[PDB]
Design a protein around this ligand. Structure first.
Ligand SMILES: *[C@@H]1O[C@H](CO)[C@@H](O)[C@H](O)[C@H]1NC(C)=O
Ligand SMILES: *[C@@H]1O[C@H](CO)[C@@H](O)[C@H](O)[C@H]1NC(C)=O
Ligand SMILES: *[C@H]1O[C@H](CO)[C@@H](O)[C@H](O)[C@@H]1O
Ligand SMILES: *[C@H]1O[C@H](CO)[C@@H](O)[C@H](O)[C@@H]1O
Ligand SMILES: *[C@H]1O[C@H](CO)[C@@H](O)[C@H](O)[C@@H]1O
Ligand SMILES: *[C@H]1O[C@H](CO)[C@@H](O)[C@H](O)[C@@H]1O
Ligand SMILES: *[C@H]1O[C@H](CO)[C@@H](O)[C@H](O)[C@@H]1O
Ligand SMILES: *[C@H]1O[C@H](CO)[C@@H](O)[C@H](O)[C@@H]1O
Ligand SMILES: *[C@H]1O[C@H](CO)[C@@H](O)[C@H](O)[C@@H]1O
Ligand SMILES: *[C@H]1O[C@H](CO)[C@@H](O)[C@H](O)[C@@H]1O
Ligand SMILES: *[C@H]1O[C@H](CO)[C@@H](O)[C@H](O)[C@@H]1O
Ligand SMILES: *[C@H]1O[C@H](CO)[C@@H](O)[C@H](O)[C@@H]1O
Ligand SMILES: *[C@H]1O[C@H](CO)[C@@H](O)[C@H](O)[C@@H]1O
Ligand SMILES: *[C@H]1O[C@H](CO)[C@@H](O)[C@H](O)[C@@H]1O
Ligand SMILES: *[C@H]1O[C@H](CO)[C@@H](O)[C@H](O)[C@@H]1O
Ligand SMILES: *[C@H]1O[C@H](CO)[C@@H](O)[C@H](O)[C@@H]1O
Ligand SMILES: *[C@H]1O[C@H](CO)[C@@H](O)[C@H](O)[C@@H]1O
Ligand SMILES: [Cu+2]
Length: 248
């Protein structure tokens, strides 16, 4: 259980949606993260994998601003509270908004996977991507590909928690969506998958007992785009400056 407090984009700190705070305000601010109803720091379950809640989390509605980024930039996600409590994989996706992300229909988004890290070693439980996040003060770093075509995209970052995933409907997904506007010179526009088609409750990386050894793990969802590393070098770094979500 947790949520993202902020993202840091080449040293530039942006406030994220805070579902434990903003819904208690009369006039919450416009931020880069989607509005969502995880006030309990909770999860989407496999029984909602074919429901809109899996796309950007519970009842999510569009962020009303966006963070402008350069293709090749890295983005750091900051989870709270410290420490993230569960074993599981970590994955990131982009979807072209074919227009402003502030107004895109989330059910139309076609997501392509730009990273994914799963079981790094061992078993029962073994070492996972989430352990790397925990070690890096609850952060994860994703690189925006150098050659991504300029455009507006939703960045969908997600932790999957597998501690209870031996039972049907046991896996816990924690998607968090952000609006970015990408500038660059490249033309890469990869083929994507609808949010409600990414995952199925019987997938071998969703219905799985991690408390066994030896253990192998197939990360759920589509392949990482050819040519991209499945992760860039992880490691936390401080912000040097602060920005606000840019409104259209
Ligand atoms: C999400 O929306 C539905 C429909 O309005 C509502 O009944 C539900 O309580 C909302 N979920 C949360 C956790 O607020
Ligand atoms: C670790 O992350 C939390 C959440 O951003 C923050 O309160 C804390 O100061 C961070 N630790 C350091 C050493 O910055
Ligand atoms: C510190 O370094 C990290 C690692 O790439 C960035 O994501 C962050 O925005 C800051 O530059
Ligand atoms: C491109 O590839 C993806 C699979 O990653 C499909 O979902 C899409 O329809 C197209 O074939
Ligand atoms: C995933 O499921 C949703 C329904 O919630 C559809 O809109 C979508 O096209 C896909 O089948
Ligand atoms: C797990 O297996 C079921 C078959 O009963 C599939 O429908 C699902 O897509 C997943 O592969
Ligand atoms: C639990 O399951 C793993 C496979 O997931 C086996 O390799 C192990 O021997 C144990 O039966
Ligand atoms: C889990 O435990 C088994 C026990 O044989 C190991 O072989 C495996 O490599 C993992 O550590
Ligand atoms: C992941 O990679 C495979 C093979 O390169 C593609 O078929 C898929 O669409 C995705 O880009
Ligand atoms: C996947 O596809 C891209 C383009 O062909 C290659 O760059 C990569 O090495 C892998 O074949
Ligand atoms: C992403 O996944 C690839 C292939 O599974 C690993 O080789 C890489 O180190 C990273 O974990
Ligand atoms: C991306 O990050 C993972 C997790 O640290 C590494 O295992 C991988 O080699 C790459 O650095
Ligand atoms: C990752 O951790 C470092 C401390 O190692 C912080 O400076 C950074 O803000 C992030 O929390
Ligand atoms: C904080 O400060 C550093 C150095 O001036 C920048 O690289 C970063 O983008 C932010 O302005
Ligand atoms: C701009 O301001 C934010 C919060 O006001 C800090 O988190 C950041 O380090 C930067 O100084
Ligand atoms: C940019 O605008 C945002 C949204 O009002 C503020 O929260 C931020 O401090 C800066 O004024
Ligand atoms: C939104 O985008 C504007 C540029 O259009 C930036 O100046 C701002 O910092 C935020 O990324
Ligand atoms: Cu939890």
């Amino acid at each position: 259980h947790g949520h993202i407090n902020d993202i840091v984009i080449n040293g530039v700190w942006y406030q994220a949606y805070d579902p434990t705070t903003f819904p208690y305000e009369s006039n919450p601010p416009i931020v880069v993260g989607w509005t969502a109803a995880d006030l309990d720091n909770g999860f989407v379950s496999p029984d909602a994998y074919q429901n809109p809640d899996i796309i950007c989390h519970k009842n999510a509605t569009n962020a009303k601003g966006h963070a402008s980024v350069k293709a090749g930039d890295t983005i750091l996600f900051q989870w709270v509270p410290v420490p993230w409590p569960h074993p599981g994989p970590i994955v990131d996706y982009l979807a072209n908004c074919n227009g402003d992300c502030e107004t895109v229909d989330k059910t139309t988004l076609e997501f392509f996977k730009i990273d994914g890290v799963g079981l790094l070693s061992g078993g029962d439980p073994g070492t996972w991507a989430s352990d790397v996040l925990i070690s890096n003060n609850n952060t994860w770093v994703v690189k925006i590909p150098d050659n991504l075509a300029p455009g507006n995209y939703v960045l969908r970052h997600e932790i999957i928690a597998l501690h209870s995933a031996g039972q049907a409907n046991g896996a816990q997904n924690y998607p968090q969506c952000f609006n970015i506007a990408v500038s660059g010179s490249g033309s890469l526009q990869p083929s994507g998958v609808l949010g409600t088609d990414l995952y199925h409750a019987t997938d071998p990386g969703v219905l799985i007992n991690i408390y066994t050894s030896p253990l192998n793990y197939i990360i759920p969802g589509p392949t990482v785009v050819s040519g991209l590393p499945t992760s860039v070098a992880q490691g936390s770094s401080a912000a040097t400056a602060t920005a606000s979500a840019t409104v259209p």
